[PDB]
Every structure is written in structure tokens, then in C-alpha cells.
């Protein structure tokens, strides 16, 4: 699978489990079309979102529902969600891992693109 | 300055200068409406986006155009932009500093929220 | 202010106040020698650690006592401290801002280096 | 293995390969005693540093030689290295993953402690 999402919790030092993730693909009219979604596993990962066939070049958005995660932990968060927007390119490495590190008032996101 | 944006470049160890920033507010019909925009200064800061009066309760999106920034430095980065989406002023007026730390394949954003 | 330290709390979205900071310089015998120390203010900043004259070329270590900070807030964090080790002024005098973003099980540190 | 180190490169969006890592254990006299070391793999990981038997409670330091990594890439770095200092505790989760995200003038480190 060409796209994986990994989410970590910087407050507990653990995978961020059961975090909803929604992936969208930018349509010709500039709107965001639902593409794939899921919830992170006990390892904070979400595999099997798409296939090589369907994951064509284009602009994608990965929305991580961080607010609901923090609310479940009873911690007041800042962001509505974490959004990661990027262009999928065929010339570069073919496996994309979108990693996110979550804190209540901060998040970082990193792309690990490999062959 | 109820809203300030600060952007740093983690490759150069400097402020990220001349970075375009667009702010939107969610309208009643759930669409994003343009709210304010500007560019970071030599200090990597953007002040004067709004006023206390105009910065009412709402869901705001701060779009930082990071791709253009990296491309002008000769780097083809991963992200199109860094988007920061948050509810503001729902418990009264606050001062928000949205900070972003940029690398070609990673970014981190932090909010510093203080009471007037 | 050739050297400034700024510390933010990513759980509260605020400056990290009253954080102890110890600066060391590597001596000729390769040991760490105390250089300066202080605590962050209400703004999360620590100024006045040194002067242009005293801040000579060398390898410096900025120790930020993050564990004590978290424990006073009721959190048992992972790290003992955040250590920032760097060569300074080897190409002439520079102004260094060492920024740290703290979470209980993670921290990020950035350096902003400018010419006088 | 109870201790793993994972290093990523935020400039290239890749694992940070062949990064030297040195682990030290704080001795009774407050000095740092060499404990384990290695170089990250092609996946940016370093496994097999120690064993459950030897990784007793105590204060450890993980030093990641980031300066040499950046120099090999021809990029001027700020830090001499990234140091991660922590206390190993038996009551909590028993597997420690020390992750580091590297940029020339910035790094972040995260501990993922699991059971």
C-alpha cells in the first residue's frame, strides 16, 4: 500500500489510538472529494487506505481528527484537526508515510517517502 | 494584535521571510470566507491581520504558503501549505500567536494563547 | 543579548514559565564548565545570560530543566532535561535564540541565528 | 529488545541512514559510561542495542551524531549532536522507542513507550 498514516501522542508517549483520519483528493473544480478514511490501530497506524492503481498523481489532503482524540482524553485542545496537504508525484519514491506527532496546542507532521 | 503569525526556517536557522499567509473564517453556510492575508516580515512575523472588533468567535483557518517559500530557495518540498484550523474567542477574546517551524518534508505548528 | 532562550509549553499553549536553564562551555581539558544560568520569565524567555565579550568561540551546552517543570504541573515526563549542544561564534559573533517546545514525552529545539 | 532508536531526515523526507548513535548509562559518580552504540540502518532504525537483562532502571543518554550526518550531505548544521536523557522505569511500559526528527537547525525527539 502506497499511503500509510502514523499518529503519536506526545503527552502520553504512545501511539494515538482510534484517531479518525479522512483522506480527500482535489477535484477539477477545486473541491475536496472523499477518497479514503479509517481509524488508527492500537499501533497508531492506518494501513490499507488505498492501492497503487487508485493513488494517482494529484493533490491530496489527510485530515486527522485531533480534537476528538483530545476530548476523549479530557484534555482541551487548540486545533480542530491536523490537515496535511501534498501532491503525490510519480517520479519520486513510491511509498508515502504521513506521520503526525500530537500535543494539545501543537502538532508536527512529517512525510517519509521511500522506494 | 489578537492574531499574529510567526514562521521559522529549520534549514537555515532563521525567520522565514516573505511567506504568504491567508486567513479564512467559516461562514454560516459552512464555507471558508476570506478573512485576512499578508506576508511575513524580515523577522518572520506577520502582524496587523485583524482587530479585536473584527476577530469574532468562529472557526478560523490560517494557510501558510510554504511550498512557494521552499521553491524560491531551490527546494521542492512535500507540502502544498501548512494549514492551521482552530476555534477562536469562544470563551471571550484571546490573543493568538500561531507559530510554524518549516522543513522541506515536515512542519510543526504551535499556538500560544494569552488573555488580554 | 548574544544568547536568548525561549521555552513554550505545548500542552497549555503558553510560555513555559520559571524553567531553569544552565549553560556550560567546553573547557580546554574537554570538561563542561559552568557558563551561565537563569530561569525563564512570564514570557517564557531568558535574557541576560551573557555578554558579547564573554560569549567567545566554543562548544556550548544549554540544559533546560524540563523534568522539574512538568512535575510541578502534575506530569511525570519522559526526559530529564532538554540539552542543546552547539558550536558558537566560530565565524565571528552571532546572536543565538535557542527555542524549545515542550511536551511530556517529546520536545523540539530550534536555533535562530542572526548577525549583529 | 527494550530500546530502539529511529531517526528521520526532515529535509529529504527519508530515514536518516548511517547515523551514529551512542548510548550511555549514568554511573554512581555522575559520569556517563558507554553502554551501547551502532549506526542506523537503511530504515533509519537501530535495533538490538541492549537486552532486557542489561537494561535496568537508571538514567540513560542517547547521543545521535547529527553533525556528521549533515556534513555528509553537505548541509551546515547547528547542533553538535542530539542528546536524549531519560530515566528507564520498570513500572511503566516495557519497550522504549526514541525517535528523532532532524533538520539542520532544529530537531525534535519523541519517546514512544509501549507494553
From Swiss-Prot, chains A, D:
Give the positions annotated as glycosylation sites: 89
What domain of life is recorded for the organism? Eukaryota
Q: What is the effect of changing residue 98 to V?
A: In AMYLD1; amyloid polyneuropathy
Q: Give the UniProt entry's GO cellular component terms.
A: azurophil granule lumen; extracellular exosome; extracellular region; extracellular space; protein-containing complex
Q: What is the effect of changing residue 41 to R?
A: In AMYLD1; amyloid polyneuropathy
Instruction: Point out residues bearing the modification Sulfocysteine.
Output: 1
**Outcome reported for the amino acid change (mutating residue 82 to S):** In AMYLD1; amyloid polyneuropathy
**Mutation effect (residue 49 to H):** In AMYLD1; amyloid polyneuropathy
NADP recorded as keyword: no
Q: How is it modified after translation?
A: Not glycosylated under normal conditions. Following unfolding, caused for example by variant AMYLD1 'Gly-38', the cryptic Asn-89 site is exposed and glycosylated by STT3B-containing OST complex, leading to its degradation by the ER-associated degradation (ERAD) pathway. Sulfonation of the reactive cysteine Cys-1 enhances the stability of the native conformation of TTR, avoiding misassembly of the protein leading to amyloid formation.
Residues holding L-thyroxine: 6, 45, 108
Q: Which residues carry this modification: 4-carboxyglutamate?
A: 33
Q: What is the effect of changing residue 41 to I?
A: In AMYLD1; amyloid cardiomyopathy
Gene Ontology MF annotations: hormone activity; hormone binding; identical protein binding; molecular sequestering activity; protein-containing complex binding
Q: Where in the cell is it found?
A: Secreted; Cytoplasm
The listed outcome for residue 105 to H is: In CTS1; amyloid deposit on carpal tunnel; patients show no other abnormalities
Per UniProt, the keywords (alphabetical) are:
Amyloid, Amyloidosis, Cytoplasm, Disease variant, Gamma-carboxyglutamic acid, Glycoprotein, Hormone, Neuropathy, Phosphoprotein, Secreted, Signal, Sulfation, Thyroid hormone, Transport
> Effect of altering residue 62 to A?
In AMYLD1; amyloid polyneuropathy
- Impact when changing residue 107 to S: In AMYLD1; amyloid polyneuropathy
What happens upon changing residue 40 to A?
In AMYLD1; amyloid polyneuropathy
Q: What is known of its domains?
A: Each monomer has two 4-stranded beta sheets and the shape of a prolate ellipsoid. Antiparallel beta-sheet interactions link monomers into dimers. A short loop from each monomer forms the main dimer-dimer interaction. These two pairs of loops separate the opposed, convex beta-sheets of the dimers to form an internal channel.
Q: Supply any other comment.
A: Tetramer dissociation and partial unfolding leads to the formation of aggregates and amyloid fibrils. Small molecules that occupy at least one of the thyroid hormone binding sites stabilize the tetramer, and thereby stabilize the native state and protect against misfolding and the formation of amyloid fibrils. Two binding sites for thyroxine are located in the channel. Less than 1% of plasma prealbumin molecules are normally involved in thyroxine transport. L-thyroxine binds to the transthyretin by an order of magnitude stronger than does the triiodo-L-thyronine. Thyroxine-binding globulin is the major carrier protein for thyroid hormones in man.
Q: According to its UniProt entry, what is the function of this protein?
A: Thyroid hormone-binding protein. Probably transports thyroxine from the bloodstream to the brain.
* Entry's family note: Belongs to the transthyretin family.
Spell out the protein name for this chain.
Answer: Transthyretin
Annotated source species = Homo sapiens
What gene does this protein come from? TTR
Of the intact sequence, the residues represented are 30 to 144 of 147
UniProtKB/Swiss-Prot annotation, chains B, C:
- Effect upon mutating residue 38 to R: In AMYLD1; amyloid polyneuropathy
Q: Which residues carry this modification: Phosphoserine?
A: 43
Query: Outcome of mutating residue 24 to V, per the record?
Result: In AMYLD1; amyloid polyneuropathy
Residues annotated with Sulfocysteine modification:
1
Q: What happens when you mutate residue 115 to S?
A: In AMYLD1; uncertain significance
- Effect recorded for residue 9 to G: In AMYLD1; leptomeningeal amyloidosis; leads to unfolding and exposure of N-89 to glycosylation by STT3B and subsequent degradation by the ERAD pathway
Q: What is the effect of changing residue 38 to V?
A: In AMYLD1; amyloid polyneuropathy with carpal tunnel syndrome
Resulting phenotype, residue 24 to I: In AMYLD1; Jewish 'SKO' amyloid polyneuropathy
Q: How is it modified after translation?
A: Not glycosylated under normal conditions. Following unfolding, caused for example by variant AMYLD1 'Gly-38', the cryptic Asn-89 site is exposed and glycosylated by STT3B-containing OST complex, leading to its degradation by the ER-associated degradation (ERAD) pathway.
Report the outcome of residue 21 to M.
In AMYLD1; amyloid polyneuropathy; by far the most frequent mutation
Impact upon substituting residue 78 to M: Loss of tetramerization
Q: What is the effect of changing residue 52 to K?
A: In AMYLD1; amyloid polyneuropathy
Q: Which residues are glycosylated?
A: 89
Going by the UniProt record, its keywords in alphabetical order are: Amyloid, Amyloidosis, Cytoplasm, Disease variant, Gamma-carboxyglutamic acid, Glycoprotein, Hormone, Neuropathy, Phosphoprotein, Secreted, Signal, Sulfation, Thyroid hormone, Transport
Quote the annotated effect of residue 101 to M: Loss of tetramerization
The UniProt-reported impact of residue 51 to A is:
In AMYLD1; amyloid polyneuropathy and cardiomyopathy
Query: Binding of L-thyroxine: at which residues?
Result: 6, 45, 108
Domain of life from the UniProt record: Eukaryota
Effect after changing residue 82 to S: In AMYLD1; amyloid polyneuropathy
The entry's note on the tissues where this protein occurs is: Detected in serum and cerebrospinal fluid (at protein level). Highly expressed in choroid plexus epithelial cells. Detected in retina pigment epithelium and liver.
The reported effect of residue 11 to I is:
In AMYLD1; late-onset amyloid polyneuropathy with carpal tunnel syndrome
Q: What is the effect of changing residue 68 to Y?
A: In AMYLD1; amyloid polyneuropathy
Its job:
Thyroid hormone-binding protein. Probably transports thyroxine from the bloodstream to the brain.
Read off the domain note: Each monomer has two 4-stranded beta sheets and the shape of a prolate ellipsoid. Antiparallel beta-sheet interactions link monomers into dimers. A short loop from each monomer forms the main dimer-dimer interaction. These two pairs of loops separate the opposed, convex beta-sheets of the dimers to form an internal channel.
Q: What is this protein called?
A: Transthyretin
Task: Quote the range of the complete protein represented.
Answer: 30 to 145 of 147
Amino acid at each position: 500500500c502506497p499511503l500509510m498514516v502514523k499518529v503519536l501522542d506526545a503527552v502520553r508517549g504512545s501511539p494515538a489510538i482510534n484517531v479518525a483520519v479522512h483522506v480527500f483528493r482535489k477535484a477539477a473544480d477545486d473541491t475536496w472529494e472523499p477518497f479514503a478514511s479509517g481509524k488508527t490501530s492500537e499501533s497508531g497506524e492506518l494501513h490499507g487506505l488505498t492501492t497503487e492503481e487508485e493513488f494517482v498523481e494529484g493533490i491530496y489532503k489527510v485530515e486527522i481528527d485531533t480534537k476528538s482524540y483530545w476530548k476523549a482524553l479530557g484534555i482541551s485542545p487548540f486545533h480542530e484537526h491536523a490537515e496535511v496537504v501534498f501532491t503525490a508525484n510519480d517520479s519520486g519514491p513510491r511509498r508515502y508515510t504521513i506521520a503526525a506527532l500530537l500535543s494539545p496546542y501543537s502538532y508536527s507532521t512529517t512525510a517519509v517517502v521511500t522506494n
